């Protein structure tokens, strides 16, 4: 069977994400370091919520809708997680550990087991500096209104960083009942990927992908160095040189699919040279996802 997995990156821009929930005077964004340098941010689970929301706006069932009425966030549910009557959030009937028992396994024969069929990892930035502020401020109303917010005035500052960052993911799934429409919708929705890290009316960021690269779609898991291309520089072109070399003389090549940035500004002669099988060269990244889904899904 076919297994596919890909990597993307977004355009450079300023950004900042609420990540502390620890202190009020100052905000911290830095999460994890590399080789003695702090240049990585962002959580590997917020994009799950972003995908869920986008799937909600695309007409698939609203199985789990976030509601904001209480002080602490709570999420409602339907009658019960069912991976057959509906998409079950891409068939995400998850663990229900409680002493009540009396689960559907004895009534609806539902073992409560998951159908994950998805893989994702935390993003990593490419710029190390996180020691700049903006020094905004908040006022005191004192307007004799019925509500006073803080009854004080403060001079609190925030931290932002201008960076572009990469993102790997894997699927490694297989077609089943009601899957082709749902997997096709997932591949359609991953193209946009907006509204990440909740609402942000002061900083606006997008996850529109450029230079998307997917690896080894028909073959079994053999990929390596998912975090390869970086520093606004192409790196998979030498990977094709060293892994599954284009010529079938010392290392036979493989079916690859390449994004738009790596071919928009790159040597014209190389396009003709990279024609042992022609690979898959496209101008806009969104164009190739439909064809890739058609090929991998088989229909």
């Amino acid at each position: 069977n076919l297994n596919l997995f890909a990597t993307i990156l977004t355009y450079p821009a300023p950004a900042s994400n609420y990540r502390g929930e620890s202190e009020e005077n100052r905000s911290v964004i830095q999460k994890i370091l590399k080789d003695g340098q702090k240049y990585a941010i962002i959580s590997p689970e917020s994009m799950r919520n972003a995908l869920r929301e986008m799937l909600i706006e695309l007409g698939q069932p609203n199985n789990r809708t976030r509601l904001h009425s209480e002080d602490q966030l709570a999420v409602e549910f339907k009658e019960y997680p069912n991976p057959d009557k509906f998409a079950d959030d891409f068939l995400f009937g998850y663990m229900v550990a409680q002493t009540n028992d009396a689960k559907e396994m004895k009534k609806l024969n539902r073992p409560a087991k998951r159908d994950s069929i998805f893989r994702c990892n935390m993003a990593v930035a490419v710029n190390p500096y996180k020691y700049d502020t903006v020094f905004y401020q908040s006022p005191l109303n004192a307007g004799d209104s019925a509500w006073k917010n803080s009854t004080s005035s403060a001079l609190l500052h925030r931290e932002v960083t201008h960076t572009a960052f990469q993102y790997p993911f894997a699927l490694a799934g297989k077609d089943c009942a009601a899957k082709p429409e749902w997997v096709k919708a997932l591949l359609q929705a991953i193209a946009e990927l907006n509204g990440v890290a909740g609402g942000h009316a002061r900083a606006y960021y997008e996850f529109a992908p450029r230079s998307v690269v997917a690896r080894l779609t028909p073959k079994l898991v053999a990929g390596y160095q998912t975090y390869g291309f970086d520093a606004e520089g192409n790196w998979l072109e030498l990977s094709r040189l060293t892994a599954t070399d284009s010529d079938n003389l010392d290392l036979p090549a493989n079916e690859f699919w390449l994004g738009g940035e790596l071919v928009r500004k790159m040597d014209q002669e190389q396009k003709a040279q990279l024609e042992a099988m022609g690979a898959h060269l496209y101008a806009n990244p969104e164009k190739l996802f439909a064809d890739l889904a058609d090929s991998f899904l088989g229909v």
Partner: protein, 108 residues
Amino acid sequence: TREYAEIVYKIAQGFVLSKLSSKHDLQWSKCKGNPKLEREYNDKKEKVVNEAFLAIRSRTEKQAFIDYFVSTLYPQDEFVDFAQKLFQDTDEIRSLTLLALSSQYPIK
């Protein structure tokens, strides 16, 4: 004992005292004059000490290098060797400075 211990303690108390006497322009003699002026002086020292305490933790490990806030708190012949001693193996110097800041923290 002309060692690191008193040197960092001396510069720590001198640093905090100097800039509070610059920003706020206050002396301890005026503080003891009346209980009223003392408490906001204590409160003003409260804000001064904590902002450095939190921020010095913000920059950690070798990325702190030997360049610190307000240019290493702007600290003769003993300076030459002492600078070289703190040139290498800087991890303990920053850790022990937090003790001086906690010492300068007002009681109660």
